[PDB]
Design an enzyme around this catalytic site. Structure first.
Site, mmCIF file in Angstrom:
data_model
loop_
_atom_site.group_PDB
_atom_site.id
_atom_site.type_symbol
_atom_site.label_atom_id
_atom_site.label_comp_id
_atom_site.label_asym_id
_atom_site.label_seq_id
_atom_site.Cartn_x
_atom_site.Cartn_y
_atom_site.Cartn_z
ATOM 1 N N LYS C 38 0.841 -1.172 0.000
ATOM 2 C CA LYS C 38 0.000 0.000 0.000
ATOM 3 C C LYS C 38 0.885 1.234 0.000
ATOM 4 O O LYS C 38 2.058 1.174 0.391
ATOM 5 C CB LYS C 38 -0.897 -0.013 1.209
ATOM 6 N N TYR C 269 32.332 29.410 11.520
ATOM 7 C CA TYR C 269 32.059 30.785 11.926
ATOM 8 C C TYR C 269 31.025 30.826 13.054
ATOM 9 O O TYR C 269 29.964 30.202 12.974
ATOM 10 C CB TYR C 269 31.549 31.616 10.742
#
Lengths: 384, 384, 384, 384
Positions: C38, C269
């Site tokens: 399904k 950073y």
């Protein structure tokens, strides 16, 4: 070396809030102004807002949604009368009287079965002109009720009041519901003999878009959501150009880092974009971690009255801006909203057999602190 | 007819918070307890928490992250000494002194360039034993600094302090970082001549899992996150069975509707499930609109000390519960968490050339009100 | 220079899917295996899964939820019989027959009013043993129906079938619902005279945790969700140690960048963390943009059979890993789930007067492509 | 009784897609049309889209982002030439030749070091006129390259091409980048001697808003995102009124339940709103569970060409509509978008030392099936 423990915040200018109460007074030629402060001042702070209104005399009462908010306001040395909206337990009678809290009369049965008490209980009579289950919808019950009140000198009628559900909606089906409600108000109140200075008809929307209709009494207006300066109609109607409500709040941050980045250098690791010219770039300590960010435009911010551009990739906690000159760290930054008049609260109501659930909640950056600016803020002791 | 304007809330038992400070005092045999209250009391309310600690004498100072929180606490009539963590501007010297606020000494340069001032400035000397950029990491600089302090009788040394980054982590790489930091503390402090009653070494994690290590001074402990009763290790370590910290907060709601629903009837429109027996069902005014709901188990709630089951489809604002008998509307309901010890705050740090950003924020139902329960709450004026 | 236009993907090993059908055959001593597919093979791909099952003979039929999936499978040259679960319009009779599609008999009325048609219609008789509205719940209606079928040689009875709702739940109230359903099956089927090789009783949960109960026929088993190798009980029950279902899927990515970063250098950073030793670091092109990431543990990934650690800040599209040696860009990376057995689908059902809505949907990285690996994948033409 | 196993879906009209290729051909007077199909046909389905273009002759080639998509298209019996955008491994040479796949020439080095091979390799020469790292940015390298190609008759030059980054942006800084790129194109291509019928210059944005600029060659246009009928500029520019691109996709659902609800009855449990008149109300099986819902307006839907209103509370899986007459269950419903031209894909690029990551992904209801409608759909075998 500097530590930023408050990288973002909501800045609330209390002068501008005062100013808004003042404008809408003049716009409606109102005598009394009752400042509605639900959901902690629409998520901006009921106490500081209330103190600002007491000191400037720009409100004559305060309306709130919960007894416990009335009690807190009292603790904070607010002395104006306060009216709590959905509370009327016979068991709280003493609290209401001792703390000078106005309550709503919900039904004729409630008045008839009032128990005995000391002092003066201040009460408001709510006229169901339609979209609600609170108060009186029959002309005979209202005069029954006026009899019980008049006969009892310990009851002090503070207001006879209603409001219009569709003043903030646009259209034809809504202009007619407005008329229907106004018909009911009149059917229910004319020839009752009420001292007309007790009438309160106007919520925010009524105040804004129906100030010239003589059929509406502006004796005592009840401005709520409009205090913050937002558009109460959620897009549907345009604010009247002659009414100058100020938006009182901003989301702000500050520069956490400044870097000289040169004419072609890469702006960040992995980044598509390079930088157009020699010049300074600021890193601001917000990004996609901040759910409030998704209501802000992501091309510009305001620094120093001026509008500098956002460049590059926004990370989870970093946003970068090209500055016009060099600024020092700690310099304030103000965010710009996709829609300046956007709502800062959401309301949810549910009706059940014996109970009405009415929940208002903030939708503006609920996890950051409210900071108060302006001279009024200094004077009321909220500007540290 | 009853109006619920406060359908959900966070209930905070201040007695239990006090009790937690008391337990951890006994657990560590501590002399002084400095209650760390960051992020508005870990999103539970710094003022009410602080007042509860002053009245019960369960804390001897308060530590906060922003000057403006110190000032507010002062306004709220807190008299204990207060120490603000990342503030040391020479321009705020007057504020610090006049309001009896302890500040951190960040560097030898800062002490040498102290300007002239009146009164007593209370200062804390931070020992960088590793994972930070604040304070002193060299033995000669510390004794230089102790000289400048001793020589100046307007400086009052409040604490010489550090904390261990990896006390709340599990493992071997972390036991060794702990040792490394403890080595540095000793290298940096032994033979300096400090009055040892000034030493403060223990954050929450140090207090909990290292209370039997004699090498740690518990002279002045600094419990923060553990005040709320959560597990500070986020899953990694198990709380010691002998330490009985109480979880102080709950998310609550109340019954908005009760329906007699019969043995086979459908529970809601479109619903898979039918009801097993004749008996009562309560509707609670929360559902998937409430982002906090996703930390709660959705099979049970607590009503009346007992644990009744959730049945059926939860909607956006409705959850249904099969009750054992009939209860009246307004009856309190308490939610149960998937994980009782789960954190109620998140912290985000960022390091830049000249600035350190350290942001703590609530992760517990930020949009609902904090309600204070218990006898202590009554006594400090926070239980309306 | 290399371009990565497929930075992440779900890798599906079709050999392992086959293997799972093979295991559960041996575990239940089953004769026929009907593979339930399904929601496009549980969001893993019905066609490739079906082709893998046809080629290895590891399934004898395929069950799907929509006619249009049957038709597509036929187009893809699948020849096994196919059974569509909720389709039985008299107007589709021709389609069903011409394409050899089995359909469910929903009611006695439906059989009695069957119109005339050519060819053989293959039908399945569903026994309502409780938790459903499809098919037959009365012993007399079943024998009425067996008469109509027997009398009509154009009807070919493919299966007489049911399934147990509470095989995947744990407890006592659930063991008893199981018994109740098994009682109904027997009440409804014993003495009806059905060729017993037509019985199909076992869904995934029945197959896994009730393989030793002789009362359950494993004549034709119907494994669905278990094909993917997940735990069908969502936490409640533990997989039997002797059954060795393989998890067939992985979320993968690849190294987009490798940098030599030196012993103390900053990792990114604004970053808290520095790097412990000289050595290489890989950047992977996923991060918090990827909603699937929140089901994965964020401390480790698998590269080259080995488990290397995630270090530093994850951004919106970047995750960094410390490698044990240097690897070339393009090297595969496999993510590790918080919970290996976690579901990859969610199901939603709604019941209304005349209609039943049964929607299954993927919850595994719906926006990325499925890639098929393994020898079986090569053979069926799905491994490019 | 009817079972709905497909309650919502994206309906894709392939005739309208064809029509869009046809329009933009006439708008640009183009000779060749190369249909760009990235991200599985912009999340609408590359195969069905490609088959529709082959059958109608509305495209002369197909461009895709991954080799494996080329191979799949070949498997699906597409015979048009196909050009894969970022693939050029010398090891795939055989695959490219045998399956008639055009590849990009990335660099002069790549051409010089071409190994020996059999058959004809079709190649495209990319002119870096700025915003990219792929291909040739020097006039001498291009003529070096044209020499190597001309000399080798196994190389078949399919295109010499570029595109403009800022054709879909508005403004002055962008009009000038456009000019700069056009300068580079000319500097890099004039006097090279290229057969001009090989030039390909126009992406979607170039095709739409620069069709009258004679400096742009429309010899071979490369329409991608515009195939779906959306506005490629994301708000910035307005579509030319004379170009009639059709939006090809819809999100649809169907009526799962119809109820006669009478003039004043309550619309749902707990609901604010009552119903205005005697008449029918449909329940649609979607709600807030469906993340796609948040791009749709929630006041109206289309049923039967007409626009009926949404009334009441939307739940997690239920939306209600007042119908004009009674409709039968199974009747199609079409959702209306807040913004018809809104994008259905998002793109993310990252640049690193040796690698470029370019990821496109659907943003339209990724978890629901694509259904193909229209006569073209029938003819290519995609309309079941």
């Amino acid at each position: 070396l500097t530590a930023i423990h408050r990288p973002t915040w909501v800045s609330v200018d209390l002068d501008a809030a005062a100013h808004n109460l003042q404008e809408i007074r003049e716009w409606t030629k109102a005598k009394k102004v009752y400042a509605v402060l639900k959901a902690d001042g629409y998520g901006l702070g009921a106490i500081p807002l209330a103190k600002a209104f007491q000191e400037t005399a720009s409100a004559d009462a305060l309306i709130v949604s919960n007894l416990d908010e009335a009690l807190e306001l009292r603790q904070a040395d607010l002395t104006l009368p306060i009216w709590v909206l959905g509370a009327w337990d016979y068991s709280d009678l003493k609290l209401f009287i001792d703390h000078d809290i106005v309550i709503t009369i919900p039904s004729l049965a409630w008045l008839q079965n009032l128990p005995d008490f000391e002092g003066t209980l201040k009460v408001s009579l709510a006229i169901d002109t339609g979209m609600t289950r609170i108060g009186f919808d029959k002309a005979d019950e209202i005069s029954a009720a006026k009899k019980i009140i008049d006969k009892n000198p310990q009851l002090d009628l503070f207001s006879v009041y209603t409001h219009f559900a569709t003043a903030d909606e646009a259209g034809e089906k809504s202009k007619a519901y407005f008329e229907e409600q106004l018909r009911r108000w009149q059917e229910l109140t004319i020839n009752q003999g009420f001292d007309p200075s007790l009438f309160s008809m106007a919520n925010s929307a009524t105040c804004i878009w129906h100030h010239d209709d003589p059929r509406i009494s502006f004796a005592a207006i009840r401005p709520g959501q409009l205090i913050s300066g937002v558009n109460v109609s959620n897009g549907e109607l345009k604010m009247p150009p002659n009414l100058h409500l100020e938006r009182i709040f901003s989301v702000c941050s500050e520069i956490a880092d400044v870097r000289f980045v040169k004419k072609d250098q890469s702006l960040s690791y992995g980044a598509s974009e390079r930088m157009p010219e020699d010049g300074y770039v600021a890193t601001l300590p917000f990004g996609y971690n901040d759910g409030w960010l998704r209501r802000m435009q992501k091309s510009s911010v305001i620094i120093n009255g001026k509008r500098m551009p956002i460049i590059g990739r926004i990370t989870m906690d970093q946003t970068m801006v090209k500055l016009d000159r060099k600024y020092p760290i700690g310099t304030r930054v103000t965010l710009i909203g996709k829609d300046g008049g956007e709502q800062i609260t959401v309301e949810e109501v549910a009706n059940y057999s014996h109970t009405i659930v009415d929940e208002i909640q903030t939708t503006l950056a609920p996890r950051i602190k409210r900071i108060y600016t302006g001279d009024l803020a200094e004077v009321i002791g909220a500007n540290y």
